[PDB]
């Protein structure tokens, strides 16, 4: 006869939902928006075991990790912005005019605005002048006012804190584990036959972008295309590149940063003046690295859309937040006119040898600065980006693309940041939190002895 | 091939192996159990979560009489309805993950039986010691 026995500590796991906490290496008063100093140190060499003879299903579209940390970022931004100045008093009449200085001809992007600003004492008011971009001021029936004056109280970032994208690790408590896939040709959903268990994830840099994923990890084998329903045209498409293309963006100008007092204990920094000529921001991208990159992705899309011509076109239009490629550079918010990048099409039949295209050729872009930002695609908040003295230059690598599809013959793919949450889905696609069930019961021939 | 003593294996190791083979790696899993700002609240929530999960298993073990025993036999017999497969094919032809999935429906019935059986093992034992 057989008897029941109880086993403790068996290798059994069950899908579950639980909270997570951060973890990052020590860095060093220095202030960071992500508060990485408060995060737990991770390890020199974390423990990772590769499991064998195991196949586990994955689904990144129903992953709570992306939803969880999405609410973490907004709270973190709120936590740091509470002790910062509020720019309500700045809602005053602006007497703006063309800036005068001795391309330079196209100077209709920054205007010399003057206004009455309250000094340290409430009763007295004095005249002050500052430079504002045309995207942040609207005219009246010949005076201008800030765009935000009729929407909500519009706050400021304290310059003491820096919001650079420090990599962080989301790690689960004891009794839970995170499963990591290792198949190089793994799409969003499907079984994984090389799953490996790890205590928690690798360094994940929170980057805010709309059309392009920057300075991120690369695919190993080949280009990875992920989408919940490819046949459905209403869902965005994530493209992960195996070869990266560098992007160089800069704002060439030495802009004096002037501190202006607007009330008792309140002082905000604005743009003082221009020392030199007026020159627009721009971004430079090599011709071959983009023509080749769109060539490789073009043939990859052919398998999913056989015998179909594939063409890449610019965005439709509308709001500037998602039409343009928005990103960050030293704390300055850019908005690059991405129209020349998607000015080509892939032909499934033809010759595409790269030597035809001349080398040392770059793609100059037109980008604009907007220091008043509404964020998370909801009109309920502000972050007024202060200016920086001198010229800035940010270099990064392009990692992925966010494309959308819109009756027969040519297939049109357009860039669009439909949802912000897809930025982190490209990094957490190979992770899944799971709960451990160390209890096991099986029959056996052993019987408990009873003392008589 | 050089041999591993099974004490050096990592967490959740031998999960895809046979049930009999995985029975020799119970120790490693047990070790990992119980390993003002925004982060503090989430971290504090994590610490309480780990304690609650660990204590749940120990509470069941104590009632069943396996308070500290890693492998413990019992007096309740196995029912063929819960599982019909032979011993040879159970310990040497499938993994623990499949086994738990198969009998997940009868888990509630078995848990009650262990509490009822072990509780009966206590009252009759008490009657025996009262004869002195």
């Amino acid at each position, epitope marked *: 006869n057989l008897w029941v026995t109880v086993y403790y500590g068996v290798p059994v796991w069950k899908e579950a939902k639980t909270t997570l906490f951060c973890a990052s290496d020590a860095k060093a008063e220095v202030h960071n928006v992500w508060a990485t100093h408060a995060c737990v140190p991770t390890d020199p060499n974390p423990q990772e075991m590769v499991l064998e003879n195991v196949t586990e299903n994955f689904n990144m579209w129903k992953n709570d990790m992306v939803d969880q940390m999405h609410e973490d970022v907004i709270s973190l931004w709120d936590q740091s912005l509470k002790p910062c100045v509020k720019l309500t008093p700045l809602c005053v009449t602006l007497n703006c005019t063309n800036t005068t200085v001795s391309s330079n001809a196209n100077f209709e992007e920054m205007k010399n605005c003057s206004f009455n600003a309250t000094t340290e004492i409430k009763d007295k008011k004095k005249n002050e002048y500052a430079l504002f971009y045309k995207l942040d001021i609207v005219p009246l029936n010949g005076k201008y006012r800030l765009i935000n004056c009729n929407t909500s109280a519009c706050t400021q970032i304290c310059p003491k804190v820096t919001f650079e994208p420090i990599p962080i690790h989301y790690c689960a408590p004891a009794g839970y584990a995170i499963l990591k896939c290792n198949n190089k040709t793994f799409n969003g959903t499907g079984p994984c036959n090389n799953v490996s268990t790890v205590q928690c994830t690798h360094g994940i840099k929170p980057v805010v972008s709309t059309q392009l994923l920057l300075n991120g990890s690369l695919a190993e084998k080949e280009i990875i295309i992920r989408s919940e329903n490819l046949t459905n045209n209403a869902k965005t498409i994530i493209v992960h590149l195996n070869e990266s293309v560098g992007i160089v963006c800069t704002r060439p100008s030495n802009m004096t940063r002037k501190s202006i007092r607007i009330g008792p204990g309140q002082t905000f920094y604005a743009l003082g003046d221009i020392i030199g000529d007026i020159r627009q921001p721009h971004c430079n991208i090599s011709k071959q690295n983009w023509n080749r990159t769109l060539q490789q992705v073009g043939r990859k899309l052919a398998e999913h859309f056989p015998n179909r011509n594939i063409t890449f076109n610019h965005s439709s239009g509308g709001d500037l937040e998602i039409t343009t490629h928005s990103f960050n550079c030293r704390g300055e918010f850019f908005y690059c006119n991405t129209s020349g990048l998607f000015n080509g099409t892939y032909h499934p039949n033809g010759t595409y040898n790269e030597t035809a295209v001349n080398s040392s050729d770059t793609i100059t872009l037109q980008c604009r600065i907007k220091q008043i930002i509404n964020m998370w695609q909801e009109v309920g908040r502000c972050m007024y980006a202060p200016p920086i003295a001198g010229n800035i230059t940010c270099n990064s690598n392009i990692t992925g693309l966010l494309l959308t599809r819109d009756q027969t013959g040519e297939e049109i793919f357009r860039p669009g940041g439909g949802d912000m949450r897809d930025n982190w889905r490209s990094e957490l696609y190979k992770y899944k939190v799971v709960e451990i069930k160390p209890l096991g019961i099986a029959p056996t021939k052993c019987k408990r002895r009873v003392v008589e | 091939a050089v041999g591993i003593g099974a004490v050096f*294996l990592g967490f959740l190791g031998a999960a895809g192996s046979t049930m009999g083979a995985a029975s020799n790696t119970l120790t490693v899993q047990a070790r990992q159990l119980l390993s003002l700002g925004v982060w503090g609240f989430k971290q504090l929530q994590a610490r309480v979560l780990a304690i609650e999960r660990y204590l749940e298993v120990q509470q069941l073990l104590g009632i069943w009489g396996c308070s500290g025993k890693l492998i413990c036999c019992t007096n309740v017999p196995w029912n063929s309805t819960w599982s019909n497969r032979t011993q040879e094919d159970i310990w040497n032809n499938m993994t623990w993950m499949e086994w738990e999935r198969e009998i997940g429906n009868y888990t509630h019935t078995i848990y009650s039986l262990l509490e009822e059986s072990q509780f009966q093992q206590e009252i009759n034992e008490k009657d025996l010691l009262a004869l002195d």
Partner: antibody
Amino acid sequence: QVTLKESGPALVKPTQTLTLTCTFSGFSMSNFGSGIYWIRQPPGKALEWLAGIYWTDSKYYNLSLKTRLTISKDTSKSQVILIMTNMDPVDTATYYCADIRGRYYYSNGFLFDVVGVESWGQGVVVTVSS
Amino acid sequence: SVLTQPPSASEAARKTVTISCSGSRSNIGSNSVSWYKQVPGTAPKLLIKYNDQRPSGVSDRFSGSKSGTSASLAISGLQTEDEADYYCATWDDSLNGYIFGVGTRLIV
């Protein structure tokens, strides 16, 4: 990424004791699957295996040079130290310290088999002369 | 207790070249064999892992297989840059060691 760097004197006298140290980074010698080998190659001929040490603190030496070889590890300094004694003129060869990648499977007990030695070192040359 | 393979397997180019390295049950039969390429004056590099898999970086041409107590390394599309000394090694458990081969020469 893993980097292996070795160091040792080039001019080595006979009959004395020599020390070879290979420095590693990017991983730990206590985690599962870790291990470093030692390979010799006299000039113009094939390679030769000296010994190897795993994360289980298990040391394996060649049968022909068991008594002449004793290996050790350092967790703090993050290095592996190889000691050899009673050299010979035929000891003139290049020393390589390399890292191994392996697999684990169960057959009447868990077993570890090396699929190959992946990460090698630049090499250090030792000469026996005067 | 040492793998024996044919040295000096030189042959022409623009064809398929097959090489073999023999062993025993202890080394080839009961363990895995890996292949290496070493031009003189520098460390070798991996070509074959797990007797049928190759790391990221090795051309599609290099391939091999294991059969009983013998293995093979099939190479096609030979070029002027595909010449070097080739080895095969495998753990044996007879001396508890990763004994290497004798080394070959591939000259076009």
